[PDB]
Design an enzyme around this catalytic site. Structure first.
Site, PDB file in Angstrom:
ATOM      1  N   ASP A 194      12.056  91.874  60.150  1.00  0.00           N
ATOM      2  CA  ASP A 194      11.152  92.669  60.997  1.00  0.00           C
ATOM      3  C   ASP A 194      10.622  91.802  62.134  1.00  0.00           C
ATOM      4  OD1 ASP A 194       9.111  91.097  59.868  1.00  0.00           O
ATOM      5  OD2 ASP A 194       7.941  92.769  59.140  1.00  0.00           O
ATOM      6  N   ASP A 196       6.862  90.940  64.038  1.00  0.00           N
ATOM      7  CA  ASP A 196       5.409  91.007  63.886  1.00  0.00           C
ATOM      8  C   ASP A 196       4.716  90.654  65.202  1.00  0.00           C
ATOM      9  OD1 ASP A 196       5.581  91.240  60.875  1.00  0.00           O
ATOM     10  OD2 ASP A 196       6.554  89.303  61.157  1.00  0.00           O
ATOM     11  N   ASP A 255       5.890  95.579  63.119  1.00  0.00           N
ATOM     12  CA  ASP A 255       4.483  95.751  62.757  1.00  0.00           C
ATOM     13  C   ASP A 255       3.630  95.352  63.953  1.00  0.00           C
ATOM     14  OD1 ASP A 255       4.994  96.582  60.168  1.00  0.00           O
ATOM     15  OD2 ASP A 255       4.454  94.686  59.252  1.00  0.00           O
TER      16      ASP A 255
HETATM   17  N1  LIG Z   1       2.503  88.235  50.065  1.00  0.00           N
HETATM   18  C1  LIG Z   1       2.021  87.551  51.132  1.00  0.00           C
HETATM   19  N2  LIG Z   1       1.183  86.497  50.978  1.00  0.00           N
HETATM   20  C2  LIG Z   1       0.697  85.799  52.024  1.00  0.00           C
HETATM   21  N3  LIG Z   1       1.006  86.092  53.299  1.00  0.00           N
HETATM   22  C3  LIG Z   1       1.837  87.121  53.596  1.00  0.00           C
HETATM   23  C4  LIG Z   1       2.408  87.926  52.509  1.00  0.00           C
HETATM   24  N4  LIG Z   1       3.187  88.864  53.087  1.00  0.00           N
HETATM   25  C5  LIG Z   1       3.126  88.678  54.430  1.00  0.00           C
HETATM   26  N5  LIG Z   1       2.314  87.645  54.724  1.00  0.00           N
HETATM   27  C6  LIG Z   1       2.012  87.133  56.074  1.00  0.00           C
HETATM   28  C7  LIG Z   1       2.844  85.869  56.231  1.00  0.00           C
HETATM   29  C8  LIG Z   1       4.080  86.365  56.954  1.00  0.00           C
HETATM   30  O1  LIG Z   1       4.712  85.350  57.741  1.00  0.00           O
HETATM   31  C9  LIG Z   1       3.519  87.485  57.815  1.00  0.00           C
HETATM   32  C10 LIG Z   1       4.561  88.509  58.211  1.00  0.00           C
HETATM   33  O2  LIG Z   1       5.197  88.964  57.024  1.00  0.00           O
HETATM   34  P1  LIG Z   1       6.792  89.147  57.027  1.00  0.00           P
HETATM   35  O3  LIG Z   1       7.201  89.664  58.389  1.00  0.00           O
HETATM   36  O4  LIG Z   1       7.136  89.924  55.779  1.00  0.00           O
HETATM   37  O5  LIG Z   1       7.353  87.639  56.857  1.00  0.00           O
HETATM   38  P2  LIG Z   1       8.131  86.760  57.982  1.00  0.00           P
HETATM   39  O6  LIG Z   1       8.147  87.470  59.300  1.00  0.00           O
HETATM   40  O7  LIG Z   1       7.542  85.370  57.878  1.00  0.00           O
HETATM   41  O8  LIG Z   1       9.647  86.697  57.419  1.00  0.00           O
HETATM   42  P3  LIG Z   1      10.837  87.705  57.833  1.00  0.00           P
HETATM   43  O9  LIG Z   1      11.843  86.836  58.531  1.00  0.00           O
HETATM   44  O10 LIG Z   1      11.295  88.234  56.493  1.00  0.00           O
HETATM   45  O11 LIG Z   1      10.228  88.766  58.717  1.00  0.00           O
HETATM   46  O12 LIG Z   1       2.449  88.069  57.066  1.00  0.00           O
HETATM   47 MG   LIG Z   2       8.350  89.173  59.935  1.00  0.00          MG
END
Ligand SMILES: Nc1ncnc2c1ncn2[C@H]1C[C@H](O)[C@@H](COP(=O)(O)OP(=O)(O)OP(=O)(O)O)O1
Ligand SMILES: [Mg+2]
Length: 331
Positions: A194, A196, A255
């Site tokens: 995704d 962010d 998001d």
């Molecule tokens: N379970 C959690 N515990 C702590 N922080 C979190 C959790 N889930 C999400 N976050 C925070 C840290 C993440 O870097 C941020 C965005 O989530 P996410 O987009 O799912 O991860 P990411 O962007 O780092 O990896 P991806 O490459 O899978 O998108 O929100």
């Molecule tokens: Mg992400």
């Protein structure tokens, strides 16, 4: 010696132990699918240690003096070094439970509890879910409708295009408002699941009502496939964008999070991750410094006070930690 907490050591994007860390992370993920949260954290921590090492682990002797490397994680690494494969990991990979839980939890709007419920009820495939639409939320229906695109890695080029349309919409709705890329892409990742974005404005309160305006603009350009707006704690929109491509298009999860500028440093720190890094940073804060850290602030429960931060650097400094830029938070 390597420090115990992931927030006390740099973890770069690329490292020398990808086979070993991948195997430990399969076991961590499988543990999470069975509700075994302690075991998840334990495997995640061990994999994180390998990511911080400066050299490949070629022999088991190299494990010595490392924290978070108990008997089980060591055995896994030992079998991989000696035999090129770990039987426990291969059994998990091949298991219907793991495959189905991975299938289901990957879909937009599906967590472990929902996926486990569906498993227990005899659902196994994406077609099985489509045969039972009354079991699905609207968000999950959208995730199924776009599942192929949503399980195609999001690329940096996709992110740049999305950041342009989001910045254009934000700038047109409110001059002075800003958009900051967060999540794994801010950490230097080349791909992701995704995108962010964190939105704010330098005058506290000028961010009010901004997000619905931004969404109206994006929707009127044909760029939105799915949007769920929620007032609650930060205002946020969970979206699927329709990203135009040469001769095509692809759905991409985005998001959008709005934070008031006073909370922005906490929000940026929280949303930048990695998930393990932030878990470790919060544990460190509570256990070592007696402060409670979250995406909104840093609270002293004894004094009943909130720390005023202008930046991420302020927060690290206040916690007695050397600053780590986002590309070293890849725990
Ligand atoms: N379970 C959690 N515990 C702590 N922080 C979190 C959790 N889930 C999400 N976050 C925070 C840290 C993440 O870097 C941020 C965005 O989530 P996410 O987009 O799912 O991860 P990411 O962007 O780092 O990896 P991806 O490459 O899978 O998108 O929100
Ligand atoms: Mg992400």
């Amino acid at each position: 010696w390597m420090p115990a907490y992931a927030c006390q050591r740099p973890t770069p994007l690329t490292h020398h132990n990808t086979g070993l860390s991948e195997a430990l992370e399969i076991l961590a993920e499988a543990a999470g699918f069975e509700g075994s949260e302690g075991r998840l954290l334990t495997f995640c921590r061990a994999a994180s240690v390998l990511k911080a090492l400066p050299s490949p682990v070629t022999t088991l002797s190299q494990l010595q003096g490392l924290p978070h490397f108990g008997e089980h994680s060591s055995r896994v690494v030992q079998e991989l070094l000696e035999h090129g494969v770990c039987e426990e990991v291969e059994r998990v990979r091949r298991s219907e439970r793991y495959q189905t839980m991975k299938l289901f939890t990957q879909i937009f709007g599906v967590g472990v509890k929902t996926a486990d419920r569906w498993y227990r009820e005899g659902l196994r495939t994406l077609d099985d879910l489509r045969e039972q639409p009354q079991k699905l939320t609207q968000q999950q229906k959208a995730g199924l409708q776009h599942h192929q695109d949503l399980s195609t890695p999001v690329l940096r080029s996709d992110v740049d295009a999305l950041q342009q349309v989001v910045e254009e919409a934000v700038g047109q709705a409110l001059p002075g408002a800003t958009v900051t890329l967060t999540g794994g892409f801010r950490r230097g990742k080349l791909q992701g699941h995704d995108v962010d974005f964190l939105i704010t404005h330098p005058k506290e309160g000028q961010e009010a009502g901004l997000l619905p305006r931004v969404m109206c603009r994006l929707q009127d350009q044909g760029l939105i496939l799915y949007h769920q707006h929620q007032h609650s704690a930060f205002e946020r929109s969970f979206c699927i964008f329709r990203l135009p491509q040469p001769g095509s298009w692809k759905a991409v999860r985005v998001d959008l999070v709005v934070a008031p500028v006073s909370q922005f440093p906490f929000a940026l720190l929280g949303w930048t991750g990695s998930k393990l890094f932030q878990r470790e940073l919060r544990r460190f804060s509570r256990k070592e410094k007696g402060l409670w850290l979250n995406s909104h602030g840093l609270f002293d429960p004894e004094q009943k006070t909130f720390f005023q931060a202008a930046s991420e650097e302020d927060i690290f400094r206040h916690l007695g930690l050397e600053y780590l830029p986002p590309e070293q938070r890849n725990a």
